[PDB]
Scaffold this active site. Sequence first.
Site, PDB file in Angstrom:
ATOM      1  N   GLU A   1       1.393 -27.885  30.270  1.00  0.00           N
ATOM      2  CA  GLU A   1       1.614 -26.588  29.467  1.00  0.00           C
ATOM      3  C   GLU A   1       1.537 -26.998  27.876  1.00  0.00           C
ATOM      4  OE1 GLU A   1       1.281 -23.928  30.289  1.00  0.00           O
ATOM      5  OE2 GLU A   1       1.542 -23.843  32.504  1.00  0.00           O
TER       6      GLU A   1
ATOM      7  N   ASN B   1      -1.839 -15.504  23.244  1.00  0.00           N
ATOM      8  CA  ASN B   1      -2.694 -15.097  24.245  1.00  0.00           C
ATOM      9  C   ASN B   1      -3.692 -13.789  23.717  1.00  0.00           C
ATOM     10  OD1 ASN B   1       0.195 -15.459  26.197  1.00  0.00           O
ATOM     11  ND2 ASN B   1      -1.635 -16.958  26.427  1.00  0.00           N
TER      12      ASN B   1
ATOM     13  N   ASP C   1      -3.704 -11.050  24.950  1.00  0.00           N
ATOM     14  CA  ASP C   1      -3.236  -9.785  24.925  1.00  0.00           C
ATOM     15  C   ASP C   1      -2.095  -9.605  23.980  1.00  0.00           C
ATOM     16  OD1 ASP C   1      -1.044 -11.356  25.949  1.00  0.00           O
ATOM     17  OD2 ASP C   1      -0.814 -10.340  27.761  1.00  0.00           O
TER      18      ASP C   1
ATOM     19  N   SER D   1       0.768 -11.685  23.432  1.00  0.00           N
ATOM     20  CA  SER D   1       1.847 -12.267  23.738  1.00  0.00           C
ATOM     21  C   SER D   1       1.733 -13.674  23.440  1.00  0.00           C
ATOM     22  CB  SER D   1       2.236 -12.121  25.183  1.00  0.00           C
ATOM     23  OG  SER D   1       1.148 -12.834  25.861  1.00  0.00           O
TER      24      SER D   1
ATOM     25  N   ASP E   1       3.142 -17.806  24.179  1.00  0.00           N
ATOM     26  CA  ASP E   1       3.810 -19.026  25.025  1.00  0.00           C
ATOM     27  C   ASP E   1       4.645 -19.994  24.289  1.00  0.00           C
ATOM     28  OD1 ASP E   1       2.495 -17.466  27.089  1.00  0.00           O
ATOM     29  OD2 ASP E   1       0.799 -18.986  27.319  1.00  0.00           O
TER      30      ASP E   1
ATOM     31  N   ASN F   1       6.431 -17.147  28.484  1.00  0.00           N
ATOM     32  CA  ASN F   1       5.559 -15.907  27.896  1.00  0.00           C
ATOM     33  C   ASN F   1       6.479 -14.822  27.436  1.00  0.00           C
ATOM     34  OD1 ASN F   1       3.822 -13.466  28.488  1.00  0.00           O
ATOM     35  ND2 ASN F   1       2.607 -15.003  27.550  1.00  0.00           N
TER      36      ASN F   1
END
EC number: 3.2.1.17
Length: 129
Positions: free
Chosen positions: A35, A46, A48, A50, A52, A59
């Site tokens: 990760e 991301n 969309d 959002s 992380d 998220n």
Amino acid sequence: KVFGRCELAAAMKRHGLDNYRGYSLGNWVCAAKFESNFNTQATNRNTDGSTDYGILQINSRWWCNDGRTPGSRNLCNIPCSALLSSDITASVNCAKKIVSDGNGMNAWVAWRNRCKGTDVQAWIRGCRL
């Protein structure tokens, strides 16, 4: 902070992640490796909108507040910035909520694709725990 492999394993154990919801320490170390490459300051945007955050790439769509993810929730009740600290307490607490949410560690796409079903004990081999 960029953790070493055994240093992170120890920190995770101290904070009660080893065998949490049945997932052995190696699974958590493996998920952190892919990760964030063990970097507490890791961030990734991301498509969309959002973002992380942190060592386990938690998220903003569901789990933390960053003030720029419309319609999102903050189920861990923390600012996403808290997930970037050198101290991993906030990330671990939130990860416990996430892994309890119904789909286990499949919530972490990198865990499903790169860790699930592999020899995850390799990630804690040689470590004084």
